[PDB]
Amino acid sequence: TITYTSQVANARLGSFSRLLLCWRGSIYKLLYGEFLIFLLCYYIIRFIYRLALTEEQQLMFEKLTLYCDSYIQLIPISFVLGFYVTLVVTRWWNQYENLPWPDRLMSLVSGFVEGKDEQGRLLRRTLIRYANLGNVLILRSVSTAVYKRFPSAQHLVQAGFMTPAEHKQLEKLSLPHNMFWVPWVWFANLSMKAWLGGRIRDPILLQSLLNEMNTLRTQCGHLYAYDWISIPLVYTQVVTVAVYSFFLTCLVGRQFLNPAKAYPGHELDLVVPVFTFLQFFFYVGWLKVAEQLINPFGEDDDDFETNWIVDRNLQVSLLAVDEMHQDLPRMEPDMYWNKPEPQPPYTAASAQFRRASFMGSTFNISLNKEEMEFQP
Amino acid sequence: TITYTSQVANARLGSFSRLLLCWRGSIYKLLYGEFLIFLLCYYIIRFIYRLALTEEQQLMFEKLTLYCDSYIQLIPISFVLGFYVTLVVTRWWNQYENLPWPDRLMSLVSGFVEGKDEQGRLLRRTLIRYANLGNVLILRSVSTAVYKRFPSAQHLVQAGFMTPAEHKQLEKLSLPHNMFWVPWVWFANLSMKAWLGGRIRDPILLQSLLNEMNTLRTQCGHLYAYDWISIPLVYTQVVTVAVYSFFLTCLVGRQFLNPAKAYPGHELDLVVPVFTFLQFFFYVGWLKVAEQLINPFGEDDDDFETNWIVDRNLQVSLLAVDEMHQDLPRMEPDMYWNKPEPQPPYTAASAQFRRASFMGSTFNISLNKEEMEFQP
Amino acid sequence: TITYTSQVANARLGSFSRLLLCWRGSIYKLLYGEFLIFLLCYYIIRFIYRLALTEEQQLMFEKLTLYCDSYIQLIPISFVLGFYVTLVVTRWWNQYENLPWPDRLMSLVSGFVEGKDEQGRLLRRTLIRYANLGNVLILRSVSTAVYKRFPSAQHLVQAGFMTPAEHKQLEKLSLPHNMFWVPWVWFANLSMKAWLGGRIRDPILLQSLLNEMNTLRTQCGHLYAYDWISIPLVYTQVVTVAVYSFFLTCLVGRQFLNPAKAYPGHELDLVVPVFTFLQFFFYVGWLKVAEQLINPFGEDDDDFETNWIVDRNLQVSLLAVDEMHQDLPRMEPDMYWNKPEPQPPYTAASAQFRRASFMGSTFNISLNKEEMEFQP
Amino acid sequence: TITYTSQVANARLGSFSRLLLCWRGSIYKLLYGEFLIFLLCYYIIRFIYRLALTEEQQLMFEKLTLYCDSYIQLIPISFVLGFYVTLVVTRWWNQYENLPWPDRLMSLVSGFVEGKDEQGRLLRRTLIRYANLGNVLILRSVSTAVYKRFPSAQHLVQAGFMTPAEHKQLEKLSLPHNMFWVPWVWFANLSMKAWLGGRIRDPILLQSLLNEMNTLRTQCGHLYAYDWISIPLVYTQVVTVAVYSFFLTCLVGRQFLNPAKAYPGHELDLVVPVFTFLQFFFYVGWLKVAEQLINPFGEDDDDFETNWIVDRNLQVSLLAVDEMHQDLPRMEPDMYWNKPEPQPPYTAASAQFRRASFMGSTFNISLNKEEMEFQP
Amino acid sequence: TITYTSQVANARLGSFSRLLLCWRGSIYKLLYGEFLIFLLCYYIIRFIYRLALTEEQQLMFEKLTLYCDSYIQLIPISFVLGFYVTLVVTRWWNQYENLPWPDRLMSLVSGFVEGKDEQGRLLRRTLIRYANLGNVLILRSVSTAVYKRFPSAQHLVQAGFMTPAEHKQLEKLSLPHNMFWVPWVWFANLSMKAWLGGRIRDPILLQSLLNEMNTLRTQCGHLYAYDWISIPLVYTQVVTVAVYSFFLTCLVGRQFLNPAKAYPGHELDLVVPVFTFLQFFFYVGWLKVAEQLINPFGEDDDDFETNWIVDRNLQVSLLAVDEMHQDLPRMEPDMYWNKPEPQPPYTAASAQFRRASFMGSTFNISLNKEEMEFQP
Ligand SMILES: [Ca+2]
Ligand SMILES: [Ca+2]
Ligand SMILES: [Ca+2]
Ligand SMILES: [Ca+2]
Ligand SMILES: [Ca+2]
């Protein structure tokens, strides 16, 4: 993930222009290889047309180049790119939205599962650990970076996400499908045992805990689905054919013909087809957007930081359920205790942001006295 | 389903170009027959124009070809294809999203329905079996592959989804509509009986169970709806007419006229209309996207793997409710038991993914000492 | 509703081409009258230009025809048609999605409302009948076919949706607005009475029942809203003006001018403007999509089958709450009772659908032994 | 709101053509003034060019007119209009969707809040009145028509939405922001008092009541948000500049040049630029769609009928909570009491709508006997 | 936020035209600097071409200008701008939708947490303060204006959002990630303690409180996500390249060539390329829409008023939980106490808004007596 939120906070002079000076996650890094190949091919065709061919071959080539430049079109390619890239971006955001965060569940576990003694600590930590374990199982199923971190279940044991007893239990249950769902069943059964043991005081709390857990299960199922059900291959191939055929046609139809022939549009032979290069930048970069985002769990600069999420979720959830269990800051009267209309101060840098309230669009409507009278 | 997620994890050099080497679920497999017919027709017209016609007939044909190539348009067809294919793809993803998964329900059944004895096993298995049975009833109503697997209710009995007693009960209840809804009523009544019998300890658990079950019912109703309410026939016919009329017009308007006449754009007769073939590939493949996805429960390469889902759901749900009922890995202190800030290690291949946390976009803002002072 | 789901299960050779042989719900049926009028007008203009006009009038007409064909544009019309038809189709699917189905509620009523005696039957049937009654009240408010079936409340009494006592109660409550909301209030009050009478054992069940009922109420409110708040008239008029002005302009600008004048593009006078007819088919059929779907509760071939839904819902809900109340198939061990990994068999026709599980996109990643080592 | 749902129930001959005969909420009413101004300006330019200018000035003007007609473009304007108007229409429908209806809440209040005595009536009426009061407070904040009806809080007292005691309490609580949120806090506190007083029998009913109330609060918050956060001014200005610059350019580039000069496309001087007028109708009406819908709570023909909604909600909610409280039609066996498969009759006008059930797309698949055999 | 809702309530004559007279949040303010730079560059090129170059250099320049104006395209740029700006606007509205409002939670806290004594006040205020504190922590993480107001946690203490004890507790818990989640855990634990202490009477109320709190947590998580996961840099760079390359090409291809050469389209040298300036206004303003909205939490005129929201939420929530706790207006019979059909009056200005109810689209259907008869 390349974050440039702070650079575009305001619409300043050339806001998006400055973003062109970026390399990581940039268009340049994404398409320099394809552009170099296109450059090599274009100048190979130019050299062959300028040296190898005879006069009659050059005339035939010039006719072909005019014919090809007659057949360059930007409406269908831009259309299909817009629709396809829009689909890819929608799925990309949905995939972020199905990343499980344990925060709601961990607040419930910290509150509901009672006991500061060793059994209570053990129970709360085990529950939140089951949630984290299910999350990491699916993430290593779908993310290359997480898989590289945890290439085997033994790695999950060595890294502490899974105890040896849990690993053995998982191996007992093994079915010929991805076993990421198992920690949710474990969570449900341990939660039931906790309620029966008196660690959960009331079944409505159990209901809440299992609701949050199953929300996490649904998010993980959506992650599995996006990993499994690719955007249909035919659609990707269609868009790819459109783009690559455009630029293969440009390989000939954008040649600078011999200036001595004085064809229309070929009066001058500038060596560099700059506008064709700009079209390459546009269209191939537009395609590279989809190429990068189609699988947002790889190792691209702008792919999600899954390993960071895994680490953060483990740290925060364990802290929440263990150290913060019934551990509150002292409750004391706040600064506005007897201030009916609190007005927190502003700094010098923020004073201009003090706004009067918007009361509604109808607030300033002017009505005459007769207009306001209720009729019988 | 053709999964190429792993091939497009990163935006590598020619990522989408390599996908052109695929055959299963490819554009080639989808449109080779239509393309061969188009090839045959185009070259039939060429042969007739080059041999059968007289000089005056050839002049008339050339005028017609110029007139037809005047009338080739790409804006309306690409427009309507974009909108229609977008609708088809939206419905396709929605149809995946309404595939029932028993996982949330099975966690609830494993936790809530008590008793390791034979009656408890029987009850839990029966409940989860009712869920699976309803799912398979709708799926065989909507999916050709599942119907081929279970062409009669007796097949569902022979395959174990339905007991003979359940089959007889279903035949007693028969109405002249699809009876896929019956297992939900059975599930509700059995759940009520379980609560009254003491197998479910508290009515809030019953409420949760029935909520998950009815979520599955709603997903099945949406599956029925997509099966029943087709994309309106007129829309499909409109898009089809646009595409096929484009290429019927190309059958004449893309002929290479006699080079001896020296018409504009016909200076050279290359035998193969390569750019017209590329347009065919684009537009007809774009249409084939909709043709494949419009009914995602058929036997296309990229249709959903419904039979696999049925098998997996049965296996996993039975395991969850029977073998995993109150069967937990031993609860023991985890590796970070007295580690306040756990840091799971990284492998060599994953070490570069260790990221510092993003603290927020405002983190690096610089403010002078005077700027930070609270004003009175 | 015209269902062609089975005809498009696979992307077969000319899948969408075969759909052109349909008449019901087809483009042909939708626009043959408009096309015939357009044909009559076009050939009237041709006849007048070819017979009535003098030479100078013909020259003026030819100049006008060239001027009009200069002003034919496809970008704005296709744009506005795409956006408007997309809006219509979105609303059409939403309107299907707000059709009330009693199935979730009926499962809850069958389970929760206790008593096989006459009072229990009466209570369950009355509750589900109130749900069906509210649904039919809104549907007859919004659907022409349902209104034709039930043109007065007395028709609802004669058809059994409403008892005479209920009809009298409704007449007592009459307000000058649509009274479709009344059965929900009746349902709430009867449910409360049932809970107080001991027929509902616990208030959480009452809560669930009322939640399902109010979901139905919200769907009915959305149906009322779509019936009331039309797509704004100005938008419909804008799209209509675009399409009809295009083809009124074609009435002159697509005339085949006198071939003797040898104008550009008029070298040959083929009698039939076939490409203009294809444009008519495209654009007017595209518009007819919106015309058919804008009100999906009329009598078009592809309008929803509201009367069938009403009948089915009544039959199924009454069966569910009365005959199926605490009426379960015998609970017995299933076929996979002691089979830890059940594998339901496949038929010959379905054996090729047996798939291995997709384990995740990262499953096949190759890592060296050194790469997998955890670093310190 | 202009409802034409009944006029477009079926896709009849010229369905949308007949809608062109409408005046209220029509394109004509929306843009006749702008069109008249455009007419005046165009013919002023024509008169000046035909009378005031000398020969050299006319030649310069003709060159300018050709240059301007070279620069008329329809792709960007139609693009930006499509996207912007689509955004406006999406927000317009969302704003309808956030109109609060008390119906779910009123069913809950009628059922749950017990007591036919004066205190019970008073309590139920007060609760539903608080809901209606909050709704009217936000609506008068956002709707010009409602504000004109209730220009002061004293008007709300005089109209009965607010008692004098409630008005005084509101004045005590006054903060420098819109106080529409206050009735929800009042509702919560009165509901709590009702539960403590025995008027609400069980806290789950209290939970349900407050859930419905807070749903209404969220809808009101969304109404406030749409009122406050306008579509960004720059977007509106961009679309406006595009449209108005198109037609300012048309003011010169669509002049009919002197026919004596025989310029291309100016061979005939028809006095009326009819096609430019049709473009005006299209593009300016398309813009007028956004202009009307951007604030759907004003006084346009197609703005929401907020005052009617306020009146209806008050009437229906008071009836539901007061007259209909525990007031049910007599419960008696229905007409299909001993009819296992009820078939409500059809009228003559509706008999053709009797449909056979759609059993699913797979129903008609043909399989040989060998194909159906389960393999080992 | 620039609110112009009241200015566009009705579709009046030149409604959007009047909006062009705005400066704050206007297109002019957003792009005057870029436009001035473009003006300087264009006229520099004009001056160089008119003075510095020789005759042969001028001929070469004229050929280049014709070549560049051949390569100006509006379809791809408008396409990509439409899609990208649509994405930005969707995310902008979503980001408003994830702004936490405490109103639902504060109603629950005011109702459920009992006790008018000092401990009850302290408890209610502490809970609502925890909600506000979490909200301000995330907002200062994501909003530049809020960060400028609260550049350190000590500022939050000095401003009263955080007590010193809370600040110390936060410093004890510090992890190397954003600690905005901590107040939710505190809220859960304090709520649990309140329930155990008898301040919350029943666990269903606790469940409701924690549900509302966790809704706020999810909204804050979405705010963090939008702050962290920028729209991918490559997409922004692609759109920027398209726009800026268009206008860099215009710098040469829109030059007015020497009128003495009499090139096509260059017959007259008007000094100002007005239409190119209008294209600049359109396209660059369209881009500026995204530039302003891409980060809606900066200091742009149309960015959200986050500081106002913070202040309002604190004031209203403290009032709701402290002063309004069990503080109700006197309950008395309302004005329509014995009025079965209440009709609140209308003012003179609003009388024309009195509407008859829309009864449904089918209301006016005419049926003959024979048509209405039920057939056997
Ligand atoms: Ca901003
Ligand atoms: Ca990637
Ligand atoms: Ca298919
Ligand atoms: Ca219809
Ligand atoms: Ca309005």
Author numbering:
A (entry chain B), B (entry chain C), C (entry chain D), D (entry chain E), E (entry chain A): 2 to 377
Task: Reproduce text from the manuscript describing this model.
The overall architecture of hBest1 and hBest2 resembles the pentameric assembly previously shown by KpBest, cBest1 and bBest2, and retains the two landmark permeation constrictions, the neck and aperture, in the ion conducting pathway.
To elucidate the architecture of human bestrophins, we purified WT hBest1 and hBest2 for single-particle cryo-EM analysis in the absence of Ca2+ (EGTA), or after a 30 s spike of 1 μM or 5 mM Ca2+. Under both 1 μM and 5 mM Ca2+ conditions, most of the hBest1/hBest2 particles (~90–95%) were in a Ca2+-bound closed state, which is very similar to the Ca2+-unbound closed state. In both hBest1 and hBest2 structures, the neck is formed by the same set of hydrophobic residues (I76, F80 and F84) as those previously reported in bBest2 and cBest11, underlining a highly conserved neck in bestrophins. Firstly, I205 is the narrowest point (radius 0.9 Å) within the cytosolic region of the ion conducting pathway, similar to I180 in KpBest, whereas the counterpart in cBest1 is V205 (radius 1.3 Å). This structural divergence is rooted from their different primary sequences: in cBest1, the side chain of Q208 fits in a pocket enabled by G209, whereas a serine at this position in hBest1 (S209) makes a hydrogen bond with Q208, causing the amino group of the Q208 side chain to point directly in towards the central axis. Notably, a direct contact between F354 and E300 in hBest1 is disrupted in hBest2 due to an insertion of F at position 353, which also offsets the residue numbers of hBest1 and hBest2 by one within this region.
